[PDB]
Amino acid sequence: SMSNRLIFDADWLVPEQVQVAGQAIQYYAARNIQYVQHPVAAIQVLNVFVPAAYLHGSSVNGYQRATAPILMPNTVGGYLPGPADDPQRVTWPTNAGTIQQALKRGYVVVAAGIRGRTTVDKSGQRVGQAPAFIVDMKAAIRYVKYNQGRLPGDANRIITNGTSAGGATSALAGASGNSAYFEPALTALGAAPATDDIFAVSAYCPIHNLEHADMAYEWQFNGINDWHRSGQLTVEEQALSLALKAQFSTYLNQLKLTASDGTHLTLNEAGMGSFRDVVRQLLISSAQTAFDQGTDIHKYAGFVVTGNQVTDLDLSAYLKSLTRMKAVPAFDQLDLTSPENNLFGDATAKAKHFTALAQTRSTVTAQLADAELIQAINPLSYLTTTSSQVAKHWRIRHGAADRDTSFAIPIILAIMLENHGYGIDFALPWDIPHSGDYDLGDLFSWIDGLCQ
Structure with a gap:
């Protein structure tokens, strides 16, 4: 309700640890934060995880409380709902291991829950079909930026990450910053009054350009x-x-x-x-x-x-x-x-076509x-129009053994990015299947290159 002021309080953060590389990694957590005023599904909460140093006035890997990158990973796959992730989570789907490593690397992590095609409200009505996934991602981003300086991490250094449909979500957030198309949806949710453009995109095998x-x-x-x-x-x-x-x-x-x-x-x-x-x-x-x-x-x-x-x-x-x-x-x-097909359905139709x-x-x-909805959820739509603010830095990977979509799909995205002056780091890693987060050493070196 409107009683939810969407104000983060660092006093919510409580101390935890997790093991990483044979070392105990200290961090703080604040879980189950309602990131809009008018959620329609229970999944619409986010978790915040912060390296312990930033609550004691110290540094990690060249970062401080005010300057750390904010990694925003999602757990969306198959355009299904993606619960708020957690370094302590063992239930599928989860990228808990990535969160653990990110914390060690000095990143603040904001892990938002995202509606998907099977999400229903309390009346049993579908409320998670397109463009719910990206509306939620944007609302979580808006929460973070609205809370710059209350929340540890630099809200001007948000980097989204995701795999597959989640990689599409990450790419779409990067492409569609502040697009007016989503404003009515964000208004109806009562999202925070802040921007949703982000700093950088990491995307593994983004299933996009549907x-x-x-x-x-x-x-x-x-x-x-x-x-x-x-x-x-x-x-x-x-x-x-x-x-x-x-x-x-x-x-x-x-x-x-x-x-x-x-x-x-x-x-x-x-x-x-x-x-x-x-x-x-x-x-x-x-x-x-x-x-x-x-x-x-x-x-x-x-x-x-x-x-x-x-x-x-x-x-x-x-x-x-x-x-x-x-x-x-x-x-x-x-x-x-x-x-x-199910992603493009609505409260009335379980599924729809999206090609002639x-x-x-x-x-x-x-x-x-x-047609406008189909266009709106395609990251490519934003690289050839002037209807948004686009992240300047992109890192895209699609496994050389990944047959879930044609190699042409991520390649088109990468070239269009290059052609329009954006930073793009792209490869097809050898014998890598449909998967993500398998090269964190390199991903984190790329983020560090951008942020330190």
């Missing part, structure tokens, strides 16, 4: 007719696949992506061209990195090694050995059965989600 993911998936996997998550593509599915693949060329070319040297990255009618070369080169680079460490890259097919150099890659051979995970369409299923193709070919009675 309305073009089917095209990208088929561009990548057409010609591979068995899928494993085991199934076999029907004749109708093969037909959609070939078409979806062809459509990707047109979508891709219209983005006007450019290589470092300024050349338009494109694909021809058959899906071959300079854009495909870029994907290949990133996978070759991933392989070279692994090869240099003594890893057997021939676990997968296609790599040409000349002396000590990965000199080329048969991309089709590689993808066959990687295997297709999803059927067709991979995201907008004709029968509305995907996580993304799947609506036209729907095998169940269905509606299309609002």
